[PDB]
Amino acid sequence: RYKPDWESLREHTVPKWFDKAKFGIFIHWGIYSVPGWATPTGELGKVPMDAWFFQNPYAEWYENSLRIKESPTWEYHVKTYGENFEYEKFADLFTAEKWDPQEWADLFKKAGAKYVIPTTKHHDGFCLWGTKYTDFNSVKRGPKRDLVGDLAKAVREAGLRFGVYYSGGLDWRFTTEPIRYPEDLSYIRPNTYEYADYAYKQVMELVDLYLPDVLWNDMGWPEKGKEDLKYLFAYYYNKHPEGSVNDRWGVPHWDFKTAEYHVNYPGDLPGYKWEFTRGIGLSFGYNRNEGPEHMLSVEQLVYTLVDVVSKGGNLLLNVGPKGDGTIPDLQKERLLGLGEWLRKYGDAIYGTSVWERCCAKTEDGTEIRFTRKCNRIFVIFLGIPTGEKIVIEDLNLSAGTVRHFLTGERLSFKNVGKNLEITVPKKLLETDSITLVLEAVE
């Protein structure tokens, strides 16, 4: 039994299932999915913040962008939908006509994800469950259906864990001015006591209807409601000890931390559990402007995953569905690619722990990441070297046997000075898929 207080809540640590699953699927789906439009300006952390809000690569931010008169979105909206076409009007166009929660679940499972977390309410305040605290929800408008619940049922039937995303920190249904600069965030918020209750009542409602595995909050928790989390966290943990929460509440407790695109990405081993998230492209909500030039390629996707996992994190890869519920082909292919690689290399991923170091490199520049499993150490190359002679810089192994992962073949290695030298038979180098994977056993 957890008591409603920070000291006590600290007794709850990231659940084992979370540490072990290493990949999850994020779903930004909503009425913003209908216009499905954003200017693909670039990655968070690379785009200067003075312009960021004016050329927002995040399509879910459509309403905010639309509220900024004369911004690309505003221009696009006027031309395509007209001026007397309010953003809310998209709730009625959002019909999920082609949606089938089971094909989604089926796909995230073939993709190798171990959990799924849909936005139940994003910054625009539209709710994807039949909530009783607002009529701006998917049961009353558009889909005429409890998207959150129906997807929770499919995911779970598919054997995956189910979490929930909630925009606690922002709700444009309670503001009128758009965010034009990052400083605006410190005062352009619901700000009211009424809002702090709404957020509280809404997450409590998600807790009681779906008892999710992850409470994924975004943009901090309304200040007036922060003391409420002591109760909500205790209430939730007492109903679901294996439940978990992220680090976006602005209170003293969290089970795992988060990083988005470049922001907060650790350079080496952070000393805590975390999770990396990004979209397959530059946006989270679907964006019909993104081509594969903006998306990651299965290979980058794989490398991204390995680098995250070697540093102790989980990759929460986002998929951005269309207003009709289908998942754009460019994203489905990248999911399947990654699913394929995980089918071959999963063993050096799921259930692994960090090693003493995350990273290494070969004398010729190929990057190396490590993962552990008791006595086993996985040497994951971010690529497949050409020569049979591999020189790993600044590495010595006290081990004794160094197998070639996929085949199992004992290999020849020698600790030469500050380096490790291994000879990988071209036959083998030729069986690996995106990464050459070795396995030391000490």
Ligand X SMILES: C[C@@H]1N[C@H](CNC(=O)[C@H](c2ccccc2)C2CCCC2)[C@@H](O)[C@H](O)[C@@H]1O
Site for its own copies in 127-186 (CB under 8 A): 176-177, 181, 183, 186
How many binding residues for its own copies (CB under 8 A)? Answer: 47
| Position among 95, 102, 134, 264 found at the interface with ligand X (CB under 6 A) | 264
CA 221 distance to own-chain centroid: 19
Instruction: Copy the structure tokens of residue 267.
Output: 């350079």
Spatial separation of the C-alpha atoms in residues 272 and 274, rounded to whole Å: 6
Residue with tokens 């030298």: 421
Spatial separation of the C-alpha atoms in residues 409 and 55, rounded to whole Å: 52
| Position among 160, 234, 296, 301 found at the interface with its own copies (CB under 8 A) | 234
* Closest to its own copies by CB, 113 or 229: 229
The number of residues in the chain equals: 442
Burial of 59 (0-12, 13-18, 19+ CB in 10 A): buried
Enumerate the β-bridge partners of residue 411: 402
Site for its own copies in 183-212 (CB under 8 A): 183, 186-189, 191-194, 196-197, 200-201, 208
Does residue number 269 form part of the binding site for ligand X (CB under 6 A)? no
| Position among 171, 260, 290, 439 found at the interface with ligand X (CB under 6 A) | 260
CB of 69 to its own copies, least distance (A): 14
Which one of its own copies, ligand X, none is in contact with 183 (Cβ closer than 5 to 8 A by kind)? its own copies
Does residue number 171 form part of the binding site for ligand X (CB under 6 A)? no
Question: Cα angle at 117 between 111 and 122, to 5 degrees?
Answer: 130
* Closest to ligand X by CB, 44 or 336: 44
- 24: phi then psi, degrees, rounded to nearest 5: -135, 160
Spatial separation of the C-alpha atoms in residues 374 and 396, rounded to whole Å: 18
- Residue 343's H or E segment, with its range, is helix 329-345
Of 4-12, 258-266, 339-347, 351-359, the window that binds ligand X (rule: CB under 6 A) is 258-266
Instruction: Copy the structure tokens of residue 427.
Output: 């036959």
Site for ligand X in 22-51 (CB under 6 A): 28, 44
Please, how many CA atoms are within 13 Å of residue 314, restricted to the half-sphere of its CB?
31
| Position among 87, 94, 210, 284 found at the interface with ligand X (CB under 6 A) | 284
Name the site residues for its own copies (rule: CB under 8 A): 1, 3-7, 10-13, 176-177, 181, 183, 186-189, 191-194, 196-197, 200-201, 208, 224, 228, 230-231, 234-235, 239, 241, 247, 250-254, 257, 270-272, 374-375
